[PDB]
Design a protein around this ligand. Structure first.
Ligand SMILES: [Cl-]
Ligand SMILES: [Cl-]
Ligand SMILES: [Cl-]
Ligand SMILES: [Cl-]
Ligand SMILES: [Cl-]
Ligand SMILES: [Cl-]
Lengths: 411, 396
């Protein structure tokens, strides 16, 4: 049936036990007003009933002799894909994040459609959670977190809404062994005529630590006006500050500043983690990204795509092989994919916060992913638990980075 | 320390479809007069017992090419020890679903391949311990022995530590063929159990009283192991029939004793007939009894490994029966109510039946591929039904 376009084949290919290639999202809701004490157990019961499943959630991987294809899954077992779980006492945010860190570590089964929805009960003050896991071969990261929003509605009076499973690389080619495709990368790089070493950039384990948090938008806009910067600048500065504090605290802050892979096009933006004052760092970040985007002003899509693909080929060789440290090119991904501008509800349950859960790799231990929802900006930090001890502390380091800017300007 | 060669095999057999870790489901009761926050209190005290004795502090490394254990320096006890809870209504059914999910997840080779999951939210003042350890680090009999050796017969003993702290395929398959051809000089039906599997698991467990089983023994003049086997035979027969997939010929069980291949007589229609032919079969079969055994199984290893030899399947299911403690056991005052093994499925061995005994009861642990064995939990009913048919037929 439907074949596997070459980018989907790639996420299957570089998947291994230490780098699962699934994305995820963590949605936090409040009990709908006037809900029985046992509202989540009631909810799980009727979701188990809902057995109709539509594309892409009924697709499953199969091979036609040698080539991977999707196929319509005749016998899908909804109690494999849908799960009702509970947090251990005391059921607060620290426990919710431990649950997602454990669950996000686990490889998905390739013999079934590669999605899971986890309904979590046991949260303290009349909240519940949805943790959704989908393989990148089946759904990329943004349309995943668009489906999770499209699954909701603006009207809190409305009920009977469905669940998510029932809804209305340029010069690459083939499967190969790693030396084979790595050598095609050298050839590509060499006939193209011819970022510091960091603790974030080493081989990783398959265990994850997830840290998420919300920050109020107008709090951040206040910092924008004071410094004459954009929202994107401040949030990138919050990441630069947090990363700086974290690596100092580990005595592992490099002398050269960190560099971030930043979609906007693709910017290789310096984070300036060698700068000490916060206002200085924000503005060097602001102009540094302003100027890096302008190198795209006089370029057509064909150009950007080719410039993008040629610039990153050495980084791809290093990620795949670990044999070219000087080619690391960026120390972390900081992704920002904007979300819905107004409050949302699932059958009268208010979405209180939506947090993406992204992919770590060998030599990218940390992936910072960002989104916005109405009042707030949402930070999702996913990291290898071994190479990044105490990763949850980066939430306080982000918050301290924003408060330092606020003090410096007296807001 | 380098891995002994059988430890190397379990790392080599492992794939996403067949993780090679074993597990144990221990069921406990609250110690007498313990508070309602007992497990949360227990959880927080186990986070502190931070010293880890071998093998639980070993981790896999390689010297140039060959695999070796090394002591793990930086052990993260928050990774290996987890504290988790059952969703509503906290039944044993929720508990078996929790184990089914955890047991499907590959272990991380970058850390000591063990895990202990303390489970709260059981309905009536009980907690559970789901322990998972990789076979290449600790095999199934040592895991269960260690798991009971962690307990004591004294309900007043306290300060008792947790388990972690106490005193290529073508090439190999072609070598299998050569070993078969230089051994065949010697002067099991197709079945739904025996297809390729997924890595998703379903675990079903249940206890039965040994007095109930002994009554059936005396009535028919069979042993305990015969009747326990007849329960398995009866259970498999019902399950396959309801699936419209009971083959003509009888299933054969691989049964460790040495190793005997016992007909389960799943074509026989009557409970007593099936019980007795199983009893005479296993009698005869061991009345014939490391070289005959490990050579008569090389063809089965070939099919399991390659799927290229279906008439060599040799057995449809493993039924292992390890004995266990005679007297009631305790952990810092918490009474062990039950101890259930969680074994390993493989390609063309979608179901594994592992048995143990504790105090007055025999424990059945069924672990199967969730897709190959839809509604695996019905087996526990068909097990019970197998014993009732025997009771009913003898008028007990
Ligand atoms: Cl896993
Ligand atoms: Cl995965
Ligand atoms: Cl899956
Ligand atoms: Cl973890
Ligand atoms: Cl592990
Ligand atoms: Cl499963």
């Amino acid at each position: 049936m439907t074949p596997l376009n070459p980018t989907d084949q790639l996420f299957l290919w570089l998947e291994k036990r230490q780098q699962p290639m699934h994305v995820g999202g963590l949605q936090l809701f409040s009990f709908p007003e006037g809900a029985p004490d046992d509202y989540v157990a009631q909810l799980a019961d009727q979701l188990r009933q809902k057995t109709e499943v539509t594309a892409p959630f009924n697709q499953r991987l199969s091979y036609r002799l040698g080539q991977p294809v999707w196929v319509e899954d005749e016998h899908l077992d909804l109690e494999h894909h849908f799960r009702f779980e509970a947090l251990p006492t005391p059921g607060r945010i620290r426990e919710l994040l431990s649950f997602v860190s454990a669950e996000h570590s686990h490889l998905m089964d390739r013999e079934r459609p590669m999605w899971e929805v986890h309904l979590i009960e046991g949260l303290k003050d009349r909240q519940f959670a949805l943790y959704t896991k989908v393989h990148h071969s089946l759904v990329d990261g943004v349309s995943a977190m668009r489906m999770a929003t499209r699954m909701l509605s603006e009207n809190p009076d409305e009920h009977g809404m469905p669940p998510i499973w029932d809804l209305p690389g340029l010069s690459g080619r083939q499967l190969g062994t790693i030396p084979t495709v790595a050598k095609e990368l050298l050839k590509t790089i060499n006939q193209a005529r011819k970022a510091p070493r960091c603790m974030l950039n080493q081989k990783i384990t398959g265990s994850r630590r997830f840290a998420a948090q919300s920050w109020c938008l107008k709090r951040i806009r206040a910092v924008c006006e004071a410094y004459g910067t954009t929202v994107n600048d401040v949030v990138t500065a919050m990441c630069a500050a947090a990363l700086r504090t974290y690596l100092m605290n580990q005595d592992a802050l490099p002398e050269k500043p960190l560099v971030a892979f930043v979609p906007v096009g693709v910017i290789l933006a310096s984070l300036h983690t060698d700068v000490q004052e916060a206002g200085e760092r924000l503005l060097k970040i602001h102009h540094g990204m302003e100027e890096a985007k302008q190198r795209y002003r006089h370029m057509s899509p064909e150009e950007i795509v080719n410039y993008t693909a040629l610039t990153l080929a050495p980084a791809a060789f290093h990620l795949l092989t670990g044999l070219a440290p000087k080619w690391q090119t960026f120390n972390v991904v900081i992704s920002n994919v904007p979300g819905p501008s107004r409050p949302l509800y699932w059958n009268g349950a208010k979405l209180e916060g939506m947090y993406p859960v992204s992919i770590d790799m060998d030599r990218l231990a940390l992936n910072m992913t960002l989104t916005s929802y109405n009042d707030q900006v949402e930070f999702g930090l996913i990291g290898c638990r071994r190479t990044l001890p105490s990763l949850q502390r980066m939430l306080d380091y982000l918050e301290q980075g924003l408060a330092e800017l606020e003090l410096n300007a007296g807001l």
